[PDB]
């Protein structure tokens, strides 16, 4: 799994008439891999320790299942899911 297509799309936006070598594209790809890791690892440190409750969509959806009856829950879980997805 690689970020190269996305990198190349971003490239065509800023510098539409300039290309990029394989070695150069591999440097770009590692760079993004390495920032993602650093951000991800730091983020995890900062979540790990935080013990306070969080309401994500997963909780809201369970709530809808619990509080809306029948037809109403299955159809509410559609509208919500679609909104969250697109």
């Amino acid at each position: 799994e690689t970020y190269k297509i996305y990198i190349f799309k971003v490239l065509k936006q800023v510098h539409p008439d300039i290309g990029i070598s394989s070695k150069a594209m591999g440097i770009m790809n590692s760079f993004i891999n390495d920032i993602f890791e650093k951000l991800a690892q730091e983020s995890s440190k900062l979540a790990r320790y935080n013990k306070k409750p969080t309401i994500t969509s997963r909780e809201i959806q369970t709530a809808v299942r619990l509080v809306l009856p029948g037809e109403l829950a299955k159809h509410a879980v559609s509208e919500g899911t679609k909104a969250v997805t697109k």
């Binding site: 997963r58 369970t62 899911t81 679609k82 969250v84 997805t85």
Partner: peptide, 13 residues
């Protein structure tokens, strides 16, 4: 848990 996309509906009620 589970925000699965099994749960979209097309053309119902």
């Amino acid at each position: 848990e589970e925000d699965a996309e099994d749960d979209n509906d097309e053309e119902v009620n």
